[PDB]
């Protein structure tokens, strides 16, 4: 427990730096880009949960659920902005895909990563799991680009 916390704290910045180097669809496969942005978002979800555990006892999650959901949304926006900048010089012969990832896909990966972590602590996060679970289908009805299952593949490896 104290060993896991030490490892997350120690490797946080380095892991994020490393993942950020594999987001360029010009040189990387789409599967790689999706996996690495997802691993970034999952890392962020763990940091999120750590930060929530140290909120005052009266600052319950059901008390201000807009705050937490917006934090989650802002995470997707920020990772998406990073991804955009990293893919700015993309050309027609890019290895990754014909299309650089829409914000819908980064959003989907974000909600996925947060759900996986937040379902482990339902007693704390039952107010949020409602809105996030719909957003998944809200986005799954917004864009089933087939590649939706290629996103599910990136959220799968252990």
Ligand X SMILES: N[C@@H](CCC(=O)N[C@@H](CS)C(=O)NCC(=O)O)C(=O)O
* Interface with ligand X (CB under 6 A): 5, 8-9, 12, 15, 18-19, 22, 32, 36, 39, 46-47, 50-51, 54
Question: Least separation, in Å, of the C-beta of 74 and ligand X?
Answer: 16
Rounded least distance, CB 60 to ligand X, Å = 18
CB of 138 to ligand X, least distance (A): 28
Q: How far is the CB of 146 from ligand X (least distance, A)?
A: 22
DSSP character for 91? -
Give the nearer residue to ligand X in terms of CB position, either 10 or 126: 10
Contact 148, 108 (CB under 8 A): yes
| Residue reference for tokens 């996030």 | 132
Handedness of CA 23, 28, 33, 39 (dihedral sign): negative
Question: Among residues 27 and 148, whose Cβ is nearest to ligand X?
Answer: 27
- Give the helix ranges, DSSP H, for 87-146: 103-118, 122-140
Nearest to 78 by CA among 52, 99, 109, 55: 109
| Residue number, 47 or 84, with CB nearest to ligand X | 47
Which CB sits closer to ligand X, 42 or 76? 42
Question: Would you tell me the crossing angle of helices 122-140 and 65-86 to the nearest 10 degrees?
Answer: 50
């Amino acid at each position: 427990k104290a060993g896991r916390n030490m490892r997350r704290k120690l490797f946080g910045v380095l892991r994020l730096k490393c993942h950020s180097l594999f987001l360029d669809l010009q040189v990387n496969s789409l599967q790689t880009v999706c996996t690495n942005i997802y691993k970034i978002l999952l890392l962020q979800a763990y940091r999120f949960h750590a930060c929530v555990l140290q909120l005052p006892f009266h600052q319950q999650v059901w008390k201000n659920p807009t705050f937490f959901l917006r934090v989650i949304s802002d995470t997707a926006s920020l990772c998406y902005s990073i991804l955009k900048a990293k893919n700015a010089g993309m050309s027609l012969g890019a290895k990754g895909a014909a299309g650089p990832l829409p914000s819908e896909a980064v959003q989907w990966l974000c909600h996925q990563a947060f759900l996986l972590k937040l379902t482990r602590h339902r007693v704390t996060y039952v107010p949020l799991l409602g809105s996030l679970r719909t957003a998944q289908t809200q986005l799954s009805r917004k864009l089933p680009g087939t590649t939706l299952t290629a996103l599910e593949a990136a959220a799968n490896p252990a």
